[PDB]
Design a protein around this ligand. Sequence first.
Ligand code: LMT
Ligand code: LMT
Ligand code: LMT
Ligand code: LMT
Ligand code: LMT
Ligand code: LMT
Ligand code: LMT
Ligand code: LMT
Lengths: 171, 606, 63, 459, 98, 52
Amino acid sequence: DSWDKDVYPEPPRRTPAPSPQTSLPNPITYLTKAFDLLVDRPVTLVREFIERQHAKNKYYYYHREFRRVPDITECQEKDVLCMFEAEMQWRRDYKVDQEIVNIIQERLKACQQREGESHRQNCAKELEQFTQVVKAYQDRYHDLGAHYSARKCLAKQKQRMLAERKAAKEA
Amino acid sequence: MNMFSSLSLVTLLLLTMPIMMMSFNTYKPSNYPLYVKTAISYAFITSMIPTMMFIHSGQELIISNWHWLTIQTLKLSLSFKMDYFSMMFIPVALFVTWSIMEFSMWYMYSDPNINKFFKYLLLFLITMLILVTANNLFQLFIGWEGVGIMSFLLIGWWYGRADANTAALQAILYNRIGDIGFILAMAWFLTNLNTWDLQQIFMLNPSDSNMPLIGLALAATGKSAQFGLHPWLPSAMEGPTPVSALLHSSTMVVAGIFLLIRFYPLTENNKYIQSITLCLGAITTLFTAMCALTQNDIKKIIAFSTSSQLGLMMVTIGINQPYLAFLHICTHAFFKAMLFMCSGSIIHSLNDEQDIRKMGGLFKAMPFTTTALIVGSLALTGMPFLTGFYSKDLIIEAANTSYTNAWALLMTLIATSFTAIYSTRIIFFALLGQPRFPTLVNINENNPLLINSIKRLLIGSLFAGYIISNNIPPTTIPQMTMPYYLKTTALIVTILGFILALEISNMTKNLKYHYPSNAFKFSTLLGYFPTIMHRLAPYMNLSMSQKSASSLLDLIWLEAILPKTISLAQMKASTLVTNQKGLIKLYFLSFLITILISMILFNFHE
Amino acid sequence: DKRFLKLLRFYILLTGIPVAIGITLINVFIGEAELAEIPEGYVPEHWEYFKHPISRWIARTFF
Amino acid sequence: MLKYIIPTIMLMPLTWLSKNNMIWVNSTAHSLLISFTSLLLMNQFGDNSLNFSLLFFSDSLSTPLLILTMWLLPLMLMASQHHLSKENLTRKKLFITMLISLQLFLIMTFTAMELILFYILFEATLVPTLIIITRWGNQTERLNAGLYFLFYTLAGSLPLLVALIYIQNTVGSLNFLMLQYWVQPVHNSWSNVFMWLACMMAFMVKMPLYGLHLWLPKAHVEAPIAGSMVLAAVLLKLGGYGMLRITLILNPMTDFMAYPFIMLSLWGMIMTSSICLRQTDLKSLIAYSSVSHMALVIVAILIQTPWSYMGATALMIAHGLTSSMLFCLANSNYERIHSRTMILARGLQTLLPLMATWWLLASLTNLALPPTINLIGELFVVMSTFSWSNITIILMGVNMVITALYSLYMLIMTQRGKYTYHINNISPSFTRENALMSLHILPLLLLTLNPKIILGPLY
Amino acid sequence: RWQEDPEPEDENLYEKNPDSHGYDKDPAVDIWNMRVVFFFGFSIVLVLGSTFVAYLPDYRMQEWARREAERLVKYREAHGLPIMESNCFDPSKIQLPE
Amino acid sequence: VVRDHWVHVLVPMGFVFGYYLDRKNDEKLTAFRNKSLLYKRELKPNEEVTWK
Ligand SMILES: CCCCCCCCCCCCO[C@@H]1O[C@H](CO)[C@@H](O[C@H]2O[C@H](CO)[C@@H](O)[C@H](O)[C@H]2O)[C@H](O)[C@H]1O
Ligand SMILES: CCCCCCCCCCCCO[C@@H]1O[C@H](CO)[C@@H](O[C@H]2O[C@H](CO)[C@@H](O)[C@H](O)[C@H]2O)[C@H](O)[C@H]1O
Ligand SMILES: CCCCCCCCCCCCO[C@@H]1O[C@H](CO)[C@@H](O[C@H]2O[C@H](CO)[C@@H](O)[C@H](O)[C@H]2O)[C@H](O)[C@H]1O
Ligand SMILES: CCCCCCCCCCCCO[C@@H]1O[C@H](CO)[C@@H](O[C@H]2O[C@H](CO)[C@@H](O)[C@H](O)[C@H]2O)[C@H](O)[C@H]1O
Ligand SMILES: CCCCCCCCCCCCO[C@@H]1O[C@H](CO)[C@@H](O[C@H]2O[C@H](CO)[C@@H](O)[C@H](O)[C@H]2O)[C@H](O)[C@H]1O
Ligand SMILES: CCCCCCCCCCCCO[C@@H]1O[C@H](CO)[C@@H](O[C@H]2O[C@H](CO)[C@@H](O)[C@H](O)[C@H]2O)[C@H](O)[C@H]1O
Ligand SMILES: CCCCCCCCCCCCO[C@@H]1O[C@H](CO)[C@@H](O[C@H]2O[C@H](CO)[C@@H](O)[C@H](O)[C@H]2O)[C@H](O)[C@H]1O
Ligand SMILES: CCCCCCCCCCCCO[C@@H]1O[C@H](CO)[C@@H](O[C@H]2O[C@H](CO)[C@@H](O)[C@H](O)[C@H]2O)[C@H](O)[C@H]1O
């Protein structure tokens, strides 16, 4: 269609077949037919017309690729020229990570609606994946403050790594 | 999906078109009120199609069409939840609003600003539909405060009247206090669940939900006018009667109960919240029904009935029956809007007389208004198989078979008896006996706008409860086994209320004067809550504002300790420096002192 | 009051109608760019990373 | 920034070389064209600010403030030209020159890349503002108001000057880009306690901070309408903008140095909202409303979180358009009844219907009705303060209740009730007055559709 | 006391010019002032400026970030990698103290 | 150019002049044109500088 099914999965659709157990006519069936004739059909033709115009003028746009530069770990201290590139990279990855957590949150919300009253059991995978990604995001970026930077992120990581070393030292 | 999603949005888009036309000068203001009424009738028709699809197969969906704003990891989209609660409330609200609007064409005919009145009524409705279909909390807040502001504008319709402006600002004040809880719930959900979306809130299912749910209860306490924040609803009677009918059946007062229903996945697991809402509902339903027993303004009697019915809904929330509470919202809308339109019919015919003591003898003079009033009264009291019976009766027998606070259950049962008493008061004093109104008779209920609008709500007050109950899917286990005395409790206490009410009413006709009792004054003056609170709290706050905040601090002490002290010192120092005799002898004598201390004390020469 | 609102409506529509019509013709006859993979050895201009033609025009002309 | 500095300067020759009857037409027309081109500043990137040269840069914080500043100059001209009609022609041109020179210092202040250049322009705005208040104010008290305005600002600014020069000596640079990479933490010491205070007190006085706010009710009341419009909309935001920038170099000391000033603000807003309930002067009521709103901005800047910085930025923009509109609304009444007393003229909705609509819309934005950007900013600040400490919801909630009471009290007292019988010169609203009102409210309500451009760098 | 002019009377612009727009005493200047305010204020800045803002090219690259995140999620889930790691920087490039 | 409307070019010319001076500033800040690690590339056969 338009989006990738892998990034935004949707289980296969299973609609039951009509099994009328009444002699009465179904009002929804005739309303659906009227909707197709009076709404879907004229709307579809107007779109097919517009698509005929867009095919006569076909042009492209691209997704910007960003080459990787050295991280703030490789920057000599107070070396602004290398700090600037690492800092800009870190900010780009920060925004992307925000959108990753949004994708995982959108999967979780779609599952909860889709599964209805069975969501508590049928959305356990999406809950787990959301829990893991939120934990990773919290470790990277939480508590940095409004004036966050790659330097502050590194200091937060080093503090976390030091505690992990000490806890293992206990073992 | 294409028809369901498409039709459920035209309903909302259809209602905004009169607003767009008015705001964009593209309308024929000949009969704008008829235009607005027609659009509402067509919205009701288009709203039935999605509802029928839900009735058929339980089809529900969420529409997140427009991405509005992303705050880091909180994406906010314009979303609409088309579920069980949305698909049944919307057609009911539109159907009731269809009658109120046709009724208001007759009732507000003489108003020079009737066009603006119908625009405000339509905005009132649009903000309620935003509230009821909101899928995230921010969208809900937009409609939550939208109905609050439209309520302010309509209650204070007659803005030359000081009482209408006091009542309007009172509604904002009490609802803003409730809104503290709404903001609290939003902040907790954002902090602890990283979401304002209803789906993520339920998926994560917080276990320690005391704080968010207390905030939600506080918001519902204000909007639904429960005990503590209750006085504003009776005061809202300052508005034109069409406002009261719409503000009490649909829109405002029901939003508080609806908010707790929307969050039943959380409340259904938190016992401590259930106890609080149960007791909050029980005191409200008992206290307000007690107040209605002695009111003489017909609108205030009906207003206190709404407060007592909303209290009953909160009790239903308190016993973990959100779906019964929702059913009561839907059934209540019919006969309560009808009752207000019946009182408006009487008030109009008696030259804006509202005291029941100056009515009487209208049973035969206003036959159609009489019929609707009796049907509305019987439905309110749970008469078997009228619309009210299909919610109220199930609520009472679900409350005496639950594991529940015994005082709350007993207080709720007494309130049911009181419901039959004040209902009998309106019929006895407005319809029966001899006329007590002025001598120039002008009664006339023969306008088709009046008749048709009430007739539709009369058909609703008879069959709507039966239709809805037989079409909604089951979502609980109805508890149908119980002792006979628990099954028929509601029916019996109602009958006892009618009998006791009739004896009390008939004793007003005896030639005996009795000094008022203490309990009579307590009921008449609303437990003195408005008399005390609305004088004491404004006085303390307003006196502090002037005496301390403004006078003591801003105009005195903050001036004294900085600018006034600093500048005074500079003036004193200036006079010391410049007050000299201009005498050569003194200046040069000071030179010698300076040179000496420069050497003796400071060693500037070393 | 009525004169002001008529003047307000007139001057908003004076440019609003040409804009709304202009936008519709752009969306119909020009249309949006299709997403494509950057060809090999090709350096897109900075305004070729945007989808809508009006966004592309803004980037190229001003930014 | 020369594409805005130069044309802004060229407004001065334009005004002085205009025909005597076209000074308002010409200046208003061309200040609107400058306002139009300011939208080119919204070429903002996710990672990098827009850095034009060694002197000037623009980011998502300064860009909305710049756009607000250049939009206000046209509006200040329309608001002024009625009460200056009898003024001498050359004195009219000088008045316009002060407004233009104020805009020039503002657009350079918000874009100066070096903090000492910011300081000089930050201070240069005092001169035109002081002249506008004292020369063209109406009352005797305008002279005292100018003195309070001048010395409250300077008492805080002079310590800031010493602190900035000290920072340049020790760090070697005051360029803001450099300070982002060369910043070092501030360790506890009595020496650093006073560096922190000298870096923050000048900006707190401008906000103003509760306790240091006494200059504002005097200055915002004695000024001519244009002076009040710029004082409330922009000049108060020099304090907020300055704090947002300098707090970068004050960490982690802001952790405990913020406490006395958060307390002054949290309690200050409840105190200054309550004051508005018993205010007898309509302009004074509006001025005290600004103190209440800017208390939230101070708290949001001090707690220093991503949500509070977004909320602070939204609040500063939203307050600028709202507070400016309210002063203009009250001025229209004053130009009819020549008094600032709120209770003097009542029931005005009966005599001026359309202008009563503007009063309502202005009041609703003031009490932060959703989804206005006033609510968006005020809500984001409350969300972040709740995380800082849950009990702050009590003070935020109470302030929201009191703010609605005084916002609707002002609406009810002036617009509703019965008209005062003896006031018989309430002429119908002029086109100029209606247009001036709609040029505040319409942009304010449009921004709701696209709020991301006023949420600042942390969006 | 002294020699001083009395306070001049109030001038209602509508008495001389019932069609006054409130800008100038001169009816011709008054019309021109209204025209520039409305055309440049409403027709240009508000209408075109609103259109400009709506079609800003990916303001602050929020749309690129969503496209980039989708690319990363697709690549990481296909290859079995974690969606997001707790460490922002590779710990092989870090030298812990002590 | 008329005697009555020449003053209306002062601000438009100031914008053009300011726009021009801004571009000349960009010509003194080319030390890293096509030299940053993020954007350094080759020049297209016909190109002269990556950005002017
Ligand atoms: C984004 C919006 C998408 C949908 C846009 C559709 C626009 C079509 C607008 C048509 C006219 C709307 O505006 C208005 O409509 C109604 C009904 O026709 C007309 O009103 C007419 O019918 C109604 C009731 O039938 C009468 O009360 C009224 O006396 C009469 O004038 C108005 O004269 C017209 O000005
Ligand atoms: C769920 C809905 C249930 C609805 C129940 C409706 C009411 C049920 C009957 C209530 C009691 C009926 O009323 C009973 O009989 C007659 C009326 O006919 C009353 O008789 C009365 O008549 C006259 C009225 O003209 C009175 O002035 C007199 O004081 C009294 O004798 C009795 O005082 C009462 O005991
Ligand atoms: C808080 C940090 C910064 C604070 C810095 C404050 C420094 C002082 C600034 C204002 C200086 C004004 O200096 C002077 O003040 C006094 C009142 O204060 C004014 O004087 C006025 O009040 C005084 C006493 O209240 C009266 O005696 C006098 O009749 C009246 O005119 C003078 O007209 C003014 O010239
Ligand atoms: C934190 C540092 C703050 C630095 C602030 C800058 C200080 C500026 C000092 C200005 C000093 C002059 O300010 C001076 O104050 C006194 C206040 O008593 C004023 O005096 C006024 O009040 C006094 C008594 O209250 C009366 O006797 C007098 O008649 C009256 O004019 C003077 O008119 C004013 O000239
Ligand atoms: C109505 C409101 C208007 C607001 C002001 C905007 C005015 C200009 C808007 C549209 C400008 C024209 O829009 C432009 O159309 C052409 C389509 O041919 C696109 O260009 C594309 O097609 C042409 C061929 O036709 C080739 O250059 C190439 O295939 C590709 O670049 C541009 O990417 C787009 O920017
Ligand atoms: C509105 C006004 C707001 C006022 C806010 C007041 C904040 C007060 C902050 C106090 C903390 C100052 O920071 C503190 O300074 C002293 C300097 O003597 C340092 O301590 C240093 O001197 C003290 C002597 O007193 C020794 O105990 C210590 O061995 C030495 O290292 C502390 O290591 C540091 O913690
Ligand atoms: C105008 C309103 C006045 C209201 C009264 C406000 C009182 C405000 C007092 C200022 C704060 C003083 O208290 C301050 O607390 C913080 C901890 O939070 C201390 O902070 C410091 O000490 C802590 C431990 O004590 C260490 O982690 C670290 O060295 C540092 O954070 C400061 O050394 C101390 O000075
Ligand atoms: C890209 C930049 C665009 C900048 C646009 C700025 C627009 C400013 C609009 C102001 C228009 C005023 O243009 C006006 O024209 C007429 C003749 O042409 C002049 O001359 C007129 O003045 C008097 C007014 O008292 C008239 O009665 C008379 O008809 C005529 O003599 C005016 O003196 C001049 O003020």
